C-alpha cells in the first residue's frame, strides 16, 4: 500500500530472497536454482 521507497536492488524472484552484492544473486540462482527458473 504505502508507496515511498524504491531504488536499484536485486531481488530473487525464485526464493523471494535478497542479497547484498549484485554478483551473489546471479551465482546464487545459478547454483541454488539449477532448474527452478
Ligand atoms: Zn533464490
From Swiss-Prot:
The chain holds residues 828 to 857 of 1243 of the full protein. May be involved in transcriptional regulation. Overexpression causes down-regulation of a number of genes involved in the immune response. Some genes are also up-regulated. This is Zinc finger protein ZFAT. Isoform 1 is strongly expressed in placenta, spleen, kidney, testis and peripheral blood leukocytes. Expressed in CD4+ and CD8+ T-cells, CD19+ B-cells and CB14+ monocytes. Isoform 3 is strongly expressed in placenta, ovary, tonsil, CD19+ B-cells and CD14+ monocytes. It comes from the Eukaryota. The gene is ZFAT. It is found in: Nucleus; Cytoplasm, Cytosol. A zinc finger (C2H2-type) spans 10-33. Zn(2+) 9 binds at residues 12, 15, 28, 33.
Amino acid at each position: 500500500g504505502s508507496s515511498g521507497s524504491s531504488g536499484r536492488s536485486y531481488s530473487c524472484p525464485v526464493c523471494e530472497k535478497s542479497f547484498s552484492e549484485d554478483r551473489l544473486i546471479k551465482s546464487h540462482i545459478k547454483t541454488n536454482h539449477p532448474e527452478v527458473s
